[PDB]
Each structure stands twice: as C-alpha cells, then as structure tokens.
C-alpha cells in the first residue's frame, strides 16, 4: 500500500471480451462518484451534490474504452491468449440501520473478490423474486485489481420474512445464497 | 466461458491537502499490472516482462511523455479543487443506538473519521471492547459496530460516546438494566 490522506481513481477504466462489455468510473476514497452509461452516452453521478456542481463529458470515456479495446487485442497476442483466472467471491449481507420491526430499512449485499467482473446479484423475499426496491453499484476497484459490488434492497422489517442474496459467479461451483435474519 | 480483461487505473495520491500529489497510472492485463507511469519516476516503466514493448514505445514518443506528466496538473491537481468544493465538505451526522452483550451501533455517517468510547459508570472501558472494522455502505456512508463484553451488575450505567467531524459535541447514548 501507499500512504496518503486521500486516494482518487480518476479513471477506473475496464474492458473485457465477454459479451464485449466495459466500464468507466471515477472513485474518491473508495466511493464511486459517477459512472458512464456507455450505450446511453451519459454521465450518471451518484450524489445529488455532484449533479449540481460537477460535469463530465461522456465522450472522453468512449475514447478511453476504444483504446483499452485496442490494447487488449495487443496484449492478448503477446501473452499467447492467457485468459483470466476466476476468483472465488466472498458475500456478506447486513442492514444499513438497526432493524426495528415496522421502520423502513435497507439490506446490503456486499460481494467481494470479483474477477472477472461478471456477476449476477439478485434478491428474493421468502419465496418470490424481489424486483422492486433493488439497486446496484458499478464494479468498484480494489488494490489487487479484483472488483467488489454492492446491491441494495429497500424493505420494511416484519416477523414473517427472512431475506436472501443470490450471487452467481464463474468461480463459484453453485450459486451462493447469503442469509439475513431479522431476529 | 473464456474471458480476457484489461484495466487502466489513473490514480492520484494526495497528502497534506495538495502539498504532496502523486500520479500513478496502471496498465493491467487480467489481474497483472504490466506497465505503469509514476510521476515520481517520471517515465513509463515495465512492471512485468509483458510491458517492455509498451513502456519503451511510450517513452520514445515525446508527445505521449509530456501529456502524461501534465496530467498531475490537468487531472490530479485540477480535480482535487473540485473535491474540496463538494466531496470534502460532505458531513453526514451518525445515528447512535445501543441494543443487546451490548452493541453501540453507529450508522450512516461520513467521512470515515470516528471515535467510539464506552463508559461503565464514570470509568472509560479500555479492555473488553470489540470494534468491527469500518463498514462501507457503498452509498457514500459508513457504519461501525462496537461491542462491550461485560454487563455484570445492575444499577450500573453504560454510556457510549461518539465523536465525528460533523459534530461540534459528541453524541452520548445510555443503557440500563
């Protein structure tokens, strides 16, 4: 590691050949300030404060991804097509606040050590898939160049509910079902 | 499936405000950094034998070497001035509760500076205090959980004192049997 007050990621550029996908995002002290919708060509800031004061032209992101797309083809040939190794992801589930029955809350599913950056994070209530109140972060960088992602579930704690986070990865033999109990 | 990954990380390291700034760009194949520009080093450098081709080509071109050195100013120093106007002024006050084996939950605060002290009556507890690491919520807020591993006597008052850069006065929450 390197000692500093604040670490900034002014260019977390990512490109991979699986279903040709990419990502561009700026991070500050471990938090994503924005990402760019590459198909929509739009900067998506992560805080109402940034949408008011901050501007980032999404054209620069598309330029960098095209260069990463180019370099990847070069280094693929120099490495004799050495593919990425699938890492075993670690999953943890916890609430944003202390759970009081009746008071709205949010469940947080942290998947860590993600590589390659391809993963499915899905929520279920108790027997049916939960699609409402679900949001996810972009792939967040780590020092060892793996990724971690976080998914959210806004819910209302009750007595007849125990929630599960389903993580699907290539480094996992079977889907991971992480458990959270209101008790 | 078979996947090939490329990453480019333009990282800026700030110490003592903008007095000590450092730029490290990283060229990564899968999970392997093969080339790198460090503003302290001044030129591109291969990290693994995969990067001498790129590093020597980039260094030979004068226009590439100047635009990368200028990024310490155009990117790192320039964007930091926008961080001072937005991110570095963010102040979210923490909510502090105590719940049953006694946990002082400190939730939804930012920045990361935090200090949790347990008090047994009039004596600060300094031994049986298990603190979880800072839990990043990923939505620009942190939480932390601090446990006190003793609740022997009735009539004793247990208070939790929390200090944060967003509070002019610490937050104090009490629990009793």
């Amino acid at each position: 590691d390197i000692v500093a007050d604040h670490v900034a990621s002014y260019g977390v550029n990512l490109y991979q050949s699986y279903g040709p996908s990419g990502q561009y995002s700026h991070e500050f002290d471990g938090d994503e300030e924005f990402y760019v919708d590459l198909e929509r060509k739009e900067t998506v800031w992560q805080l109402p404060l940034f949408r008011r004061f901050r501007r980032f032209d999404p054209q620069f992101a598309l330029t960098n991804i095209a260069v990463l797309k180019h370099n990847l083809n070069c280094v693929i040939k120099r490495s004799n097509s050495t593919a990425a190794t699938n890492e075993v992801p670690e999953v943890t589930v916890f609430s944003k606040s202390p759970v009081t029955l009746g008071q709205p809350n949010t469940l947080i599913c942290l998947v860590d050590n993600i590589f390659p950056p391809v993963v499915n994070i899905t929520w279920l209530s108790n027997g049916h898939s939960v699609t409402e109140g679900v949001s996810e972060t972009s792939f967040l960088s780590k020092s060892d160049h793996s990724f971690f992602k976080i998914s959210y579930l806004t819910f209302l704690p009750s007595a007849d509910e125990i929630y599960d986070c389903k993580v699907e990865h290539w480094g996992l033999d079977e889907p991971l079902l992480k458990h959270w109990e209101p008790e | 499936p078979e996947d090939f990954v490329y990453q480019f990380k333009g990282m800026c390291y700030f110490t003592n405000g903008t007095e000590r700034v450092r730029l490290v760009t990283r060229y990564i194949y899968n999970r392997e950094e093969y080339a790198r520009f460090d503003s302290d080093v001044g030129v591109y450098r291969a990290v693994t034998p995969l990067g001498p081709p790129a590093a020597e080509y980039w260094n030979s071109q004068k226009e590439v070497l100047e635009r990368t050195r200028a990024e310490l100013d155009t990117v790192c120093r320039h964007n930091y001035q926008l961080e001072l106007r937005t991110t570095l002024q963010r102040r979210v006050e923490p909510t502090v509760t105590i719940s049953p084996l006694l946990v002082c939950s400190v939730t939804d605060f930012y920045p990361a500076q935090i200090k949790v002290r347990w008090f047994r009556n009039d004596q600060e507890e300094t031994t049986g205090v298990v603190s979880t690491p800072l839990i990043r919520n990923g939505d620009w807020t942190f939480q932390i959980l601090v446990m006190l591993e003793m609740t022997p006597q009735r009539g004793d008052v247990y208070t939790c004192h929390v200090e944060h850069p967003s509070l002019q006065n610490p937050i104090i929450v009490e629990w009793r049997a």
Partner: peptide, 15 residues
C-alpha cells in the same frame, strides 16, 4: 463550470 478530466491511456503499437 470546470469539466473534470480523466487519465488518457497510451496506445499499444501492435496493429
């Protein structure tokens, strides 16, 4: 009205 910039990556010379 300062537009933020990123780091522009260098291009390999293979093809």
């Amino acid at each position: 009205g300062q537009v933020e910039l990123g780091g522009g990556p260098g291009a390999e010379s293979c093809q």
